[PDB]
Structure formats: C-alpha cells, structure tokens
Recover the amino acids of this structure.
C-alpha cells in the first residue's frame, strides 16, 4: 500500500450528478481523489474556472479524501506533478470508450507509468453529461433532477445575466 | 381505437429525401404526424425557421395527415403540450442510436409517459443527412438526387446570395 | 497489367505519423499515391494550404511514387479529374468506419465508378489524429513523438508568431 491517488479530470462545466456519483464511488476505492478542473480556454466554458471549482467543492466537499484543483496544461504533466496512481474517467457510451481508449494509449506513450481506470455510470445517471445539461438549461429547461442545487442556482444567475 | 399522434422533431436544415421517406412511412402507421422544426438558434441553421417550414410543407404536402410546426427545441414540454403518443426518430448509424437511446432515457425521467419510437432508413437514403447535403451544396455539388425540388431551388438562391 | 493511382484525401492539418504510415503502406501497393490536401475553407485550418502541402512533401518525399496536390470542391470531381482508381482512407475507430461507409455510398451515387479502399493503422499509430495533435500543441504539449520533424518545426514557427 504505497497509497493511491487518482485524478478525475474534466472541464466540469458544470459539475453534474453523474460526476458526483463517480467521485463518490472512486472515493471509496482509492485513498485520495483529485477533482482536476481543466481551465479549457478553447471550447470556452460557460462557467469560469473559479465558479466551476466552487461548484465542485460545494457538491463534493463532504467527502474527506477529495481535493479540488484547477489545471491548465496537459493531463500527462499534471499526472506526473501530482504523483498520481491513475486517471479515472467515466464511460457512458461507445463514443466515450473509443476516445478514452485512444487517449490512454497516447498518454502511455508519453509516460510509461501512466494508468487510466474507468467506471461506468450507475444506471440512473447514464445519460447525464455537462453538455446535455447546458443545452437543456439554455432552452430554459428544468435541470433540477440532474445536477446539485448549487448548480441550479448558478444557472439562475446566468439567466439573470442574459444567457 | 385510440388515435395516435407522433412527433417527428428535427432541425430539417434542409429537409432531405431521407426525411421524406421517414415521414411517409410514419404517416402510414400513425393517425397524425407532426413535423416539428426546432428553431435551433445555437448551432445556427443555414435556412431560417420560416424557410425550413416552407420547404417541409412543400415537400410533404401530398401526405394528408401531416402537420408542420416550429418549436423552441425543448422536446419533452412540446411532447406534453402536443398530447403526443410518441416521438419518432430515424436512426442512421450507431452514433444516432447511442445519442437517441440516452435522450429517450432522459425524457422518460422528466416525463414518465414519454415514448420514443425509431425507424431505420430505407437502404437508398441511408447515407443522407442534412449536414452532408449542406456540405456538398456549399462546394457546388449537385444535390438533386438527394433532396426535393424546392430544396434544390433554395440552395440555388443561397448561392446567388454569396454562400 | 493496369497502372493504379490512389488518392489519399484529407485536410492534413498537420500531417502526422499516422498519415505517414498509411501513405508508406499504400506506396508499396499502388503505382501512384496522390496526397490530396483539401483547402478546407470552412472548419478553417491552423496551417495554410501551402504550408500543409510543404509539410506533407517534407515528410513523405522520400517515397518516389507519391505526389502532393491541393484541391478544393468535391472529392468525387477531383477523383474523376485525376483518373484515379480509388480513394484511400484510414479507419481508426468505429466513428471513422461509420462516416466513411456513408461517404463511400454517397460518392458512389454521384459517380458509379467511385471506389474507396481502407487501411487500418499500425497499432503504434492507432490513436493519432491531426485534431489531437493540434489540441496537444496548443496546450504547449510535446508532439514530437507523433508527427514528423518538419511538423514539429512548423509548430515552433507558429509559437514564434504568437500561437
């Protein structure tokens, strides 16, 4: 038991109940979980990095071994800085599987200690992605069933500001 | 004998011979078929909502039980307002199947009376999508084999206007 | 014993080691291989057409039966002008297979002598796409493992110019 530290990277724009479920599950299996929020300058996110970090901390801060860090460059550099055991990614559908399989092979060529582990969503969260939730919210749809309360309120603020 | 009403939602940008075949098929099986054209403000369409509705009406007017309606894009609310039996989608490829499977599960959680039924294209239309036809037409390709006459003429007008 | 001429079309933005491996393999099997670089005005490329042609020449010019040509408009027209035997595409993953199956069917309806042949990548190149390489390079990642030397140097030039 060298002690395990797993990185869960994403743009979390915004965090959803799918992300909550995977972090919770991962937190039971590894000693440390780092929610790693990519700044994502290109494909420019709806919520600022600061807001996305705040939402994540609010939604998952009850788990004592979960840390929240914003990061900018490449996953493989971050993995090495963080001395991580593995990266964790959720797999929803075949398009996620093919993309992640490719990226894991790329990151392994860049760093032979890279490792990627995957979880599949619990059946009730299986369609939830941030992209879908943004689409619904932009059409003034109710996203209350799919995201934490702080995220509903952040969308309210976005609507008050024109979006 | 309960009356069935099925919604066929899309951006129809423009309507193609693929959409004509699915609507025709659906019209034979359900009492009422609503071609429901999402305004789609974001991912902004080539043709205006009014032009897309005109193209659809002119291409499907020979079917007596088809209605043509623009809507905002929020499908589950539209389904309820329309008192529909089901939403109809065409499935061309595995990417369509995965996405529609997910959205059907999402819409069912938002409304437990939601229903989605699917058709696959007839083999001669199986590669046709609006997206592909726009791309061909933009490169000054002949799309006459793939779309109704009114659409060919609409593309001509687009080219005369610089596109 | 007829001469074969195969077109390998793409945006090559930039050319990668994946493309190099497919062209090398194709050059052993066909008499003439035409690296055909679509100008691609829409989805506007990082590298100019002239730079993309020069990179491809630099990376593959050691194979004496490979030609390098820019084109605009439709692939099927270019195929006819070039009196080609077939178009060659690489298939990396299921999403490539679906898209190329569709386009082959569509191009055959536009020209019944169209033909498309496919190769799968060698296992060490199987994740590499121009889109991935651009993403990594934009985040200041090292792409040296995945692209020819000429492309690494073209990215250097891009960084010196602000990108």
């Amino acid at each position: 038991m060298s002690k395990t530290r797993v990185i869960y990277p994403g743009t979390f724009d915004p965090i959803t109940n799918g992300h909550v479920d995977l972090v919770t599950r991962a937190s039971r299996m590894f000693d440390e979980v780092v929610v790693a929020i990519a700044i994502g300058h290109h494909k420019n996110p709806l919520f600022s990095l600061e807001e996305r970090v705040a939402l994540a901390q609010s939604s998952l801060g009850h788990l004592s071994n979960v840390e929240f860090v914003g990061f900018d460059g490449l996953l493989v550099n971050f993995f090495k800085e963080q001395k991580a055991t593995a990266v964790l990614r959720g797999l929803r559908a075949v398009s996620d599987f093919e993309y992640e399989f490719q990226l894991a092979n790329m990151n392994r060529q860049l760093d032979p200690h890279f490792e990627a582990v995957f979880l599949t969503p619990s059946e009730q969260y299986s369609f939830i992605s941030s992209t879908l939730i943004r689409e619904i919210a932009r059409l003034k749809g109710d996203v209350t069933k799919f995201v934490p309360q702080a995220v509903v309120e952040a969308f309210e603020r976005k609507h008050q500001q024109g979006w």
In short: Helices of chain A lie at 17-29, 49-60, 75-81, 94-110, 130-138, 149-160. The beta strands of chain A are 5-10, 32-38, 66-71, 86-90, 116-119.
